């Protein structure tokens, strides 16, 4: 499996109820390891996975110092964005930042990214070459110009190609018994009527890690896409995931329908049916 | 590890 380290940042201006809300979370793959929350009583970057806890006080202090400096950057940002888009102070607004890096099977670098959003939409994003920017609109061109002139791309690339990958690999090694586990799906199927001559076959996958899965449905060998309902993958709350796929099916024909399950924790792919 | 460089205001 390929691996990834990402950070997600959310700033929300609350006009007249004081300073902005700031929440920062970090992930290795589908496992969250750190949070910072500006309303939480600690004002510290906190652990959220047991393998990060073995990092010393120097790690925590430095991560707090860094994350507060993110929060201060976003606190200014909200007011500048206001001016760019000619908005008054009285309205609440959001900025989101996401950055991080990918490695492959051998843990060599794959890709790095830094994307930035204002009020839901794309604002500015760093391209895959890591040396250039995509501005979404005319306001974001003033950022793009500023960020070129300060050589922000150069500083960020040193992190994404460098520090991000080293620390990714370190976390991978220190939490090997959790991050490099695969949990296979436990699978079953349910059958439910919707009329006297129609039935729903629902194909289920539970207790699996990582979140990448692919439920498909076939009829007599060939796949059926368009009576298919696929729900969004959801957390079970214990670090594992859940998903289902459904099909509206004419009654007495459940036998010709097979559910196919692919996941990285399965040697051969699974096949469930009803006949 | 968060970045400690390469973040700037818009």
């Amino acid at each position: 499996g390929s691996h990834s380290m990402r950070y997600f940042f959310t700033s929300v201006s609350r006009p007249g109820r004081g300073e902005p809300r700031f929440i920062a979370v970090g992930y290795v793959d589908d496992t969250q390891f750190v949070r910072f929350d500006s309303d939480a009583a600690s004002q510290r970057m906190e652990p959220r996975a047991p393998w990060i806890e073995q990092e010393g006080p120097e790690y925590w202090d430095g991560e707090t110092r860094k994350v507060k400096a993110h929060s201060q950057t976003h606190r200014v940002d909200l007011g500048t964005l206001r001016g760019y888009y000619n908005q008054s102070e009285a309205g609440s607004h959001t900025v989101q930042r996401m950055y991080g890096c990918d490695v492959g099977s051998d843990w060599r670098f794959l890709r790095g990214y830094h994307q930035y959003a204002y009020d839901g939409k794309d604002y500015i994003a760093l391209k895959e070459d890591l040396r250039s920017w995509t501005a979404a609109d005319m306001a974001a061109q003033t950022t793009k110009h500023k960020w070129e002139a300060a050589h922000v791309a150069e500083q960020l690339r040193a992190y994404l190609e460098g520090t991000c990958v080293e620390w990714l690999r370190r976390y991978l090694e220190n939490g090997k018994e959790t991050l490099q586990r695969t949990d296979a799906p436990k699978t079953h199927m349910t059958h439910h009527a919707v009329s006297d001559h129609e039935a729903t076959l629902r194909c289920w996958a539970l207790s699996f890690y990582p979140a990448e899965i692919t439920l498909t449905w076939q009829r007599d060998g060939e796949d059926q896409t368009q009576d298919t309902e696929l729900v969004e993958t959801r957390p079970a709350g214990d670090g594992t995931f859940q998903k289902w796929a459904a099909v509206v099916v004419p009654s007495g024909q459940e036998q010709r329908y097979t559910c196919h399950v692919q996941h990285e924790g399965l040697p051969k792919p699974l096949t469930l049916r009803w006949e | 590890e968060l970045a400690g460089i390469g973040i700037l205001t818009v």
Epitope: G62, R65, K66, Q155 | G6
Partner: T-cell receptor, first 113, second 107 residues
Framework: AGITQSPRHKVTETGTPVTLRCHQT?????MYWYRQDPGHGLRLIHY???????DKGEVSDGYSVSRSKTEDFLLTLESATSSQTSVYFC????????????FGDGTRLSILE | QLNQSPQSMFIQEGEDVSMNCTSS?????WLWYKQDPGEGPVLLIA?????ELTSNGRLTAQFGITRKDSFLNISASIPSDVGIYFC?????????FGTGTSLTVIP
């Protein structure tokens, strides 16, 4: 014309209030007042993230500070003591993470009994 | 308060100058400054990863893999290189400075 300090030189007696003023054009940024001493190097007195928002450095005692506009960062010494004879420097950082600090030209202050 | 060695060096003109800093905390940027008598410190080099960021001119600087280390080399020195030299280490939002090395150039 970057950063300006005023005054560049002041010779005054003990007990006198002294304000050092630091001005920058560029716009929204972090501002810092440091002092330079023969053995100690640059020690930080006070800093500022923005307007009305200041915090202490390693040697803040006998000093105050004020940020009414983004352009101005006033270092004030309410009753000058002789130990505050020094060379004082204003510095400037862009808002972000890990940005380099650019320095003013210095203010040399003599406080005499 | 950062460990800068040497404190003072007297060097003959045309030769090379070396100075270094040591820390106990990890930093993510290393900066090097020059100060002339009467003026402020002026930023010479800003470093962002390990390996050697080469120059404004005859000045080369390095930044340790362990991130607790940096050094400055000035080659083929010149009489106008006299002054005090400072390293700086950045922790996110603030900077810690070395004690300085005073360079003077024998002509």
């Amino acid at each position: 014309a970057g950063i300006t300090q005023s005054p560049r030189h002041k010779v005054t007696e003990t007990g006198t209030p002294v304000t050092l003023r630091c001005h920058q054009t560029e716009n929204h940024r972090y501002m810092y007042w440091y002092r330079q001493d023969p053995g100690h190097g640059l020690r930080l007195i006070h800093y500022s993230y923005g307007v009305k928002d200041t915090d202490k450095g390693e040697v803040s005692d006998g000093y105050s500070v004020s940020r009414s506009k983004t352009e101005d960062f006033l270092l004030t010494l309410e009753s000058a003591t002789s130990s505050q004879t020094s060379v004082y420097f204003c510095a400037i950082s862009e808002v972000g993470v890990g940005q380099p600090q650019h320095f003013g030209d210095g203010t040399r202050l003599s406080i005499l009994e | 308060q950062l460990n800068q060695s040497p404190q003072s060096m007297f060097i003959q003109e045309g030769e090379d100058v070396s100075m270094n800093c040591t820390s106990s905390s990890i930093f993510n940027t290393w900066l090097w400054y020059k100060q002339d008598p009467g003026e402020g410190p002026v930023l010479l080099i800003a470093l962002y990863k390990a390996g050697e960021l080469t120059s404004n001119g005859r000045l080369t600087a390095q930044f340790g893999i362990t991130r607790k280390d940096s050094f400055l080399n000035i080659s083929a020195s010149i009489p106008s290189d006299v002054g005090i030299y400072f390293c700086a280490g950045g922790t996110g939002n603030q900077f810690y400075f070395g004690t300085g090395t005073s360079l003077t150039v024998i002509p």
